[PDB]
Amino acid sequence: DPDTAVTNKQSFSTDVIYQVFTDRFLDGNPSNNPTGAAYDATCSNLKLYCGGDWQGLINKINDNYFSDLGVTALWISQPVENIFATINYSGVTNTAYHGYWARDFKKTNPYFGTMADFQNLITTAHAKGIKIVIDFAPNHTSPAMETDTSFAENGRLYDNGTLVGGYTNDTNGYFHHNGGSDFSSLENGIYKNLYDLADFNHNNATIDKYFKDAIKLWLDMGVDGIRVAAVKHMPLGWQKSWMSSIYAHKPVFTFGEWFLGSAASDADNTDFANKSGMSLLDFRFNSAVRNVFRDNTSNMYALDSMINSTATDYNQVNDQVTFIDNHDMDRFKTSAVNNRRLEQALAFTLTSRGVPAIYYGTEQYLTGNGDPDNRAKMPSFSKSTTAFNVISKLAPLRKSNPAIAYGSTQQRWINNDVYVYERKFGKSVAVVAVNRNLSTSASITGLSTSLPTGSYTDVLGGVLNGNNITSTNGSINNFTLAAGATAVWQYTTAETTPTIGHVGPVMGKPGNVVTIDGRGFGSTKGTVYFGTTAVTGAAITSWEDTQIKVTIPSVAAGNYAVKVAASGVNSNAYNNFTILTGDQVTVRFVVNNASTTLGQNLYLTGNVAELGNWSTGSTAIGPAFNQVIHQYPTWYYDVSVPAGKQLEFKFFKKNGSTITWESGSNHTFTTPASGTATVTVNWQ
Ligand SMILES: OC[C@H]1O[C@H](O[C@H]2[C@H](O)[C@@H](O)[C@H](O)O[C@@H]2CO)[C@H](O)[C@@H](O)[C@@H]1O
Ligand SMILES: OC[C@H]1O[C@H](O[C@H]2[C@H](O)[C@@H](O)[C@H](O)O[C@@H]2CO)[C@H](O)[C@@H](O)[C@@H]1O
Ligand SMILES: OC[C@H]1O[C@H](O)[C@H](O)[C@@H](O)[C@@H]1O
Ligand SMILES: [Ca+2]
Ligand SMILES: [Ca+2]
């Protein structure tokens, strides 16, 4: 299958995601609707169910609404069973319509549908070439009050009907009872409750085993991707460990929600993206896009700078999910924002790097500020709006032009209001010009591109006032970019040299199968390179021009570059591919008496790649925590680490340059065969 098929659960670069709140889209089945205070047919009280379901989704798939719009994947509300109780917040009745207050991850929300409906949705979606991505929130159950079991459902958790435990009288410690996060530190938001949501204690082996089993079920149902909710609030170590379990079973594209409030780089965010095993929603791309297109608080340079900085910060920037709005923020469209601005923003998003996601209703210009107004019912299924048109013209390009899907980005011309960027990959090119000025046009002279000699036509057909151009060996002739104009020009050709577009996942242990997508691989099974190790033969489970599935070899745990040698020609190296020691388990390391100096931090390192292999640099573990679960001078940290292996490890203090290690011999511990563990040591 090509990189381009719906069969490609490992890569969404060629896809366009449509984010839909199941409840607010379409009620294909009224029989499954809630009753009483929980239901509102007019869908005027946005905190109540409105009946949207999977059958509604199925219906629109079948009448090609999505196929005509161009979207190739659907991201839906968390499918699991939620609390049935209603919650009264300062007089207002709230329901679990959003799907985020789960009570049983082994079952479906019956208001959405049944196992059969779900299986029917996956099949119908696949028959039309639409991948299905599910929201999943392993961070918590639902709102709960420790001192009041009657509020909501006391955050109870059921394992397929069977009660596992509630927040009150939690003798086994399935949850954290450290109060609620004040968001003052990273440690704080991880070990304390997100709002009033009962917080899971993933160090509890039952909870760790519940989530592995739970996700395994949905992957088996055929899901093609996962949106992990609130990744900033669970320990990276547990999630990494969970990610490898998924990748070892049935690898699917996985991205997570790490909320950022600006285009600015965040060290914790970058680390996560680069070390967890999953990618992230790009809140940095979102701020710059909104700042420039919607709010007018920044200009074209800001946009360009965000393109350059994120590409520098993330190991795989192409794995980041972009968007112009979502259910946790004001709809892009507002009274002061014009339609052309919304349309230009989509055009930018759809031709830029990453995996584009469109919040439902954008094409209908849906308005709505805040929660839940930004979660209004899908008002129309019109295929006439320009917004709708722009998406149907551009979306397919991610499929047809590999430069959009896998290419690099380069500025070709710019100023306060104008931005002309270029996407390239092999001989294929795509050039985009955006003039955000709604009242005045710009004379563009001296524009150079990679477009071979020839005259080009706007791929938008001029719907966004685009013009056609002429290149003379990349030299574009002077032209005027009309007001509020945006034109897309492109050039595509067959690649003749093996060239890697994407590898996914980019983490795994020996035995796992990874997918390498690109061009020019040829149809004659060659050799795949993991660093210096050449993988040939039956290990390469498939080999075609745009996709190779290959088994990760038994080489030392570490960082590698993937190269594909096709017919004697070696391709480009796809860097930072992480090979693990083997299966993971999550171990909490605790150290007593590690007192420090103003600005000194505690780290950890040991004899396995997962512990940094005695490194004190960016591969060491830390800085350790010292506030919630354990207080200074006791530090602790959850680390994904190989299973049933004997590790040697030592802690070290580091402020600036000076590294001070623990004296004595290394500490030792033999990690468990499965699940989780805790090992406490005293600073030597
Ligand atoms: O009950 C608190 C809030 O829970 C949800 O918020 C989600 C948010 O929308 C999602 O993107 C993030 O991943 O997790 C939080 C918590 O589950 C509801 O969507 C909100 O309306 C609630 O207020
Ligand atoms: O760097 C490889 C070795 O790291 C540790 O050795 C430390 C030692 O623990 C500490 O007392 C001394 O001051 O520095 C050395 C070197 O950094 C491990 O203990 C060894 O097993 C490793 O080979
Ligand atoms: O809307 C609720 C939000 O609360 C916090 O900002 C969390 O970081 C985020 O995960 C969640 O979306
Ligand atoms: Ca319904
Ligand atoms: Ca948490």
d(CA 124, CA 127): 5
- The answer for 581, left when phi > 0, alpha when psi is -120 to 50, beta otherwise, is alpha
> How far, in Å, from the CA of 100 to the mean position of ligand 1?
6
**Neighbouring C-alpha atoms within 13 Å toward the C-beta of 645:** 21
Cα distances (Å, whole numbers) of residue 493 to 91, 406, 451, 518:
62, 14, 11, 13
Same domain? For 395 and 405 the reply is no
Q: How many residues does the chain have?
A: 684
Taking the alpha carbons at both ends of the chain, their separation in whole angstroms is 56
CATH number reported for the structural domain that contains residue 550 in this entry = 2.60.40.10
The pocket around ligand 2, CB under 6 angstroms, is made up of: 614, 650, 661, 663, 666
> How far, in Å, from the CA of 90 to the mean position of ligand 4?
27
d(CA 614, CA 620): 8
328 lines ligand 3 (CB under 6 A): yes
Residue 232 alpha carbon, nearest atom of ligand 3: 8
Same domain? For 7 and 147 the reply is yes
d(CA 192, CA 194): 7
- The residue to mutate among 604, 658, 666, having the most atoms of ligand 2 within 8 angstroms of its beta carbon, is 666
Q: Tokens for 381?
A: 């299924």
Residue 195 alpha carbon, nearest atom of ligand 1: 2
Q: Residues 650, 666: contact at Cβ < 8 Å?
A: yes
CA-nearest residue, atom 10 of ligand 3: 230
Phi, psi of 358 (to 5 degrees): -115, 125
Please name which of 63, 640, 69, 30 lies closest in space to residue 389, comparing C-alpha atoms: 69
Same domain? For 574 and 614 the reply is no
> How far, in Å, from the CA of 633 to the mean position of ligand 3?
31
Residue type, 660: T
Q: Tokens for 7?
A: 């069969």
Verify cis geometry, omega within 30 degrees of 0, for the bond prior to 633: yes
CATH number reported for the structural domain that contains residue 406 in this entry = 2.60.40.1180
Burial 143-175 (b: 16+ CB within 10 A, else e): bbebeebebbbbbbbbbeeeebbbbbebeeebb
CA-nearest residue, atom 13 of ligand 1: 229
Tell me the resolution in Å.
2.5
Widest distance between CA atoms in the chain = 75
343 lines ligand 3 (CB under 6 A): no
E-strand ranges in 77-191 read 80-82, 87-89, 92-94, 102-108, 131-136, 140-143, 157-159, 162-165
The pocket around ligand 1, CB under 6 angstroms, is made up of: 98, 100, 137, 143, 194-195, 197, 229-230, 257, 327-328, 371
Q: Residues 610, 578: contact at Cβ < 8 Å?
A: no
Q: Residues 480, 418: contact at Cβ < 8 Å?
A: no
Same domain? For 458 and 518 the reply is no
Same domain? For 369 and 443 the reply is no
d(CA 503, CA 519): 12
Same domain? For 490 and 505 the reply is no
What burial class does residue 64 get, using C-beta atoms within 10 Å of its C-beta: 0-12 exposed, 13-18 middle, 19+ buried? exposed
Please name which of 381, 384, 392 lies closest in space to residue 26, comparing C-alpha atoms: 381
Residue 666 alpha carbon, nearest atom of ligand 2: 19
Of 494, 525, 543, the last residue of a domain is 494
Q: Count of CB atoms within 10 A of residue 659's CB?
A: 13
Residue type, 387: A
- For residue 538, give every residue at least 6 positions away whose Cβ sits within 8 Å of its Cβ, in sequence order, or none: none
87 lines ligand 3 (CB under 6 A): no
> How far, in Å, from the CA of 136 to the mean position of ligand 5?
14
Residue 257 alpha carbon, nearest atom of ligand 1: 13
Residue 664 alpha carbon, nearest atom of ligand 2: 11
Q: Which domain holds residue 421?
A: 401-494
d(CA 403, CA 490): 9
CATH number reported for the structural domain that contains residue 23 in this entry = 3.20.20.80
Sign (positive or negative) of CA dihedral 52, 57, 62, 64: positive
Same domain? For 330 and 221 the reply is yes
Same domain? For 435 and 510 the reply is no
3-state secondary structure of 269: helix
| Domains identified in the chain, total number | 4
Q: Residues 142, 101: contact at Cβ < 8 Å?
A: yes
Residue 195 alpha carbon, nearest atom of ligand 3: 4
d(CA 230, CA 245): 19
259 lines ligand 3 (CB under 6 A): yes
d(CA 250, CA 225): 10
Method: X-ray
Same domain? For 155 and 239 the reply is yes
Question: Residue 195: nearest ligand to its CA?
Answer: 1
d(CA 650, CA 596): 16
Residue type, 70: G
Burial 286-296 (b: 16+ CB within 10 A, else e): bbbbbbbbbee
